[PDB]
Structures are given as C-alpha cells and as structure tokens.
DNA sequence: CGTCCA
DNA sequence: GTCTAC
DNA sequence: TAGACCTGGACGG
C-alpha cells in the first residue's frame, strides 16, 4: 500500500463507520509484536485521516460513555500487506491483528487491521512520524517546496528512482508510483536525483508525484470499493503503464528493490 | 511437492 | 515498506 | 545503510 491506498483506507473507515458505534476493548491478536491499545469505552466512534503513507484513527467516546475518557489517536503504517476491513464479528479474517467491535443494537461487526505479513506498525498517540515530509496528495505546495529548498541534502546525490522512495521528501510515493511517474516523463531511473530537479528552481516531475497518485485515488477500489475484490485488481492493473508490465526493463537499485522502466537505465545503474 | 517473489 | 542492529 | 522481518500466491518439476 502507497499513498493512494492509505487515502482510500482512510475514506473507507469514515464512510463505513459514519453511522457505527463501537464499545468494549481494542482487541489485538496474540501474535502481533505491536503495542496493546489501552482504551475501553461503552460507546465511541472511529474516524480516520491520511498523510502520505500513514493513517491516523481517532477513538472518540460518546457523551456519558463510561469510563470518562479523552479521545485516543493511533497512527498506522500498513507495510506491504496492511488493510482495514469491516467484517461480521463471528467471521474475523486470518491476520486480523487489531479489532474494534460494534456495540449493540443491530449486527455485531468488527473493524480489523488485517496484515498478512505483519510489516505494519501502530503507535499510541496520534503524532505523524517525525521526519516524513508533506503528503504528496494533501500538501502539494509544502511537498514541492520541501524538495526544491533541500536539493543540497545527500539524499539527492542518490539516483532519482532511489530518492523518490525517501519518505522525508516523497511521503506516500512507493515502488509502483516511482515506476509509473518516471515512465510518464521517460526520466532514466538512474539519473542523479539532484540533476533531474535542479532544472525546476507540461507537467514536471513534482506535479506528477501528486497528479499520478491522485489518478489512483479517483479510480477508487484497491480493497475498499464495494466491487468484487479481484475486479478492483483488474482495473488498477489496466491503469499501470510500466510496473511489472510485459516488455519493460527492470533493475535492482542499491537497496535491492525492482525499479521498472522503458529504454535507457541511466548513468548510475548497477 | 518446492523456490522465488511481492 | 520499513526499521533497527549492524 | 542493507538485510531481517512475514505470509500467501504463482510457477515449476
């Protein structure tokens, strides 16, 4: 999951929980090495917001819900396989590692953090990760300026395809988005990051770090769209013009992550 | 069955 | 896609 | 900074 998937998850939680009321403990699977979430309430509402590759849940108790309590905020990072699901209480998925339960009247549901590979993390109390830059979806101008102000950082010594994954400067961009963005401009993946951007002190690279993830958000789906699960997959796959597509060049970057591209790999390639 | 990949 | 122990 | 952290699915003999 990258920025778009975090954004769409945030929307899913707000649409799906708008008319729900949760109660009880926040239950966590025995196996999760993540922290227990110390929050019980007889009645409370879950809302969400996204920032790049992070999602913040707020647990907001209702007036007179016992015990008297302030709202609690968690922040989630999805890793490679993190998702939210609203599932009947009796049919929890495999790999449901954090669960919020509906209070009664009506059907016993469960909002689950489902994470097959358990790479996802949650932190108590609400703060975005110190160091992550502005969201490419929701803070374009702050994101765009944060980069152009700091091209003298060592991160931009790296090749462009490597720098595009630096969450200090491209919060929300992941492996598929760097493939899609660089393909749209035909920027060789192993051009020096600084050289590609020095030009910018017809959509440029930084517009596309925003407009391309936004194309994904507006397409919808990706586990959230009320579509048949593997229907969402087909549409997204149809959208991809470069990433793991037949007849595309492919290399490992200095961290051993597959960058996909057309034509010239660029001056700094293994 | 069993590696290779995300 | 980190995150932390090299 | 590069590998350890994980599971299920796709491909192959």
HEC profile of chain A? CCHHHHHHHHHHHHHHHCCCCEEEEEEECCCCCCCCEEEEEEEEEEEEEEECCEEEEEEEECCCCCCCCCCEEEEEECCCCEEEEEEECCCCCCCEEEEEEECCCCCCEEEEEEECCCCCEEEECCCCCCCCCCCCCCCHHHHHHHHHHCCCCHHHHCEHHHHCCCCCCCCCCCHHHHHHHHHHHCCCCCCEHHHHHHCCCCCCHHHHHHHHHHHHHHHCCCCCCCCCHHHHHHHHHHHCCCCCCCCCEEEECCCCCEEEECCCCCCCCC
Contacts from A223-230 at CB under 8 Å and sequence distance 24+? A223/A5, A223/A8, A223/A9, A223/A12, A223/A83, A224/A8, A224/A9, A224/A11, A224/A12, A225/A8
In terms of DSSP bridges, do strands A82-88 and A96-101 run parallel, antiparallel, or are they unpaired?
Answer: unpaired
A2 is catalytic: yes
**Is strand B less than 7 A from the beta carbon of A258?**
yes
A60: β partners: A45
Spatial CA neighbour of A259 closest among A165, A193, A169? A165
Q: Which nucleotide is nearest to A172 (CA to C1')?
A: C1
Structure solved via: X-ray
Please state whether strand D lies within 7 Å of residue A154 at its CB atom: no
Q: Which nucleotides of B are covered by protein (CB under 7 A)?
A: 5-6
CA angle A49-A53-A55, nearest 5°? 25
Q: Which residues pair with A89 in a beta bridge?
A: none
A34 in a labelled binding site: no
- In angstroms, how far is C6 C1' from A45 CA? 43
Nearest nucleic acid nucleotide to A80, CA to C1' distance: C1
Take residue A99 and report the two structure tokens written for it. 């669960």
- Which of A53, A162, A180, A222 is the catalytic position? A53
C-beta of residue A67 within 8 angstroms of C-beta of residue A84: no
> In this structure, what are the phi and psi dihedrals at residue A254, rounded to the nearest 5 degrees?
-60, -15
Beta sheet of A54-61, edge-to-edge order: A82-88, A109-115, A96-101, A22-28, A37-51, A54-61, A72-77, A121-124
Q: How far apart are the first and last CA of chain A?
A: 27
C-alpha A261/C-alpha A26 separation (Å) is: 44
Widest Cα–Cα separation across chain A: 64
Judge if the beta carbon of A178 is closer than 7 A to nucleic acid strand D: no
């Amino acid at each position: 999951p990258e920025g778009p998937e975090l954004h769409l998850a945030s929307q899913f939680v707000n649409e799906a929980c708008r008319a729900l009321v949760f109660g009880g403990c926040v239950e966590k699977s025995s196996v999760s090495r993540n922290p227990e979430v110390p929050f019980e309430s007889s009645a409370y509402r879950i809302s969400a917001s996204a920032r790049g590759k992070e999602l913040r849940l707020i647990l907001s108790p209702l007036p007179g819900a016992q015990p008297q309590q302030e709202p609690l905020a968690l922040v989630f990072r999805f890793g490679m396989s993190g998702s939210f699901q609203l599932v009947p209480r009796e049919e929890l998925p495999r790999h449901a590692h954090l669960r919020f339960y509906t209070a009664p009247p009506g059907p016993r549901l469960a909002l689950c953090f489902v994470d097959i590979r358990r790479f996802g993390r949650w932190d108590l109390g609400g703060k975005w990760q110190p160091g992550r830059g502005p969201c490419v979806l929701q803070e374009y101008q702050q994101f765009r300026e944060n980069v152009l102000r700091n091209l003298a950082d060592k991160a931009f010594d790296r090749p462009i395809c490597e720098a595009l994954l630096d969450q200090r400067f491209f919060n929300g961009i992941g492996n598929y988005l760097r493939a899609e963005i660089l393909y749209r401009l035909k920027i060789p993946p192993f051009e020096k990051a600084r050289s590609v951007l020095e030009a910018l002190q017809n959509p440029d690279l930084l517009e596309l770090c925003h407009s391309v993830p936004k194309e994904v958000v507006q397409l919808g789906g990706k586990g959230y769209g009320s579509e048949s699960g593997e229907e969402d997959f087909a549409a997204f796959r149809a959208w991809l013009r470069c990433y793991g597509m037949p007849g595309m060049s492919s290399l490992q970057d200095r961290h051993g992550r597959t960058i996909w591209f057309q034509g010239d790999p660029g001056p700094l390639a293994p």
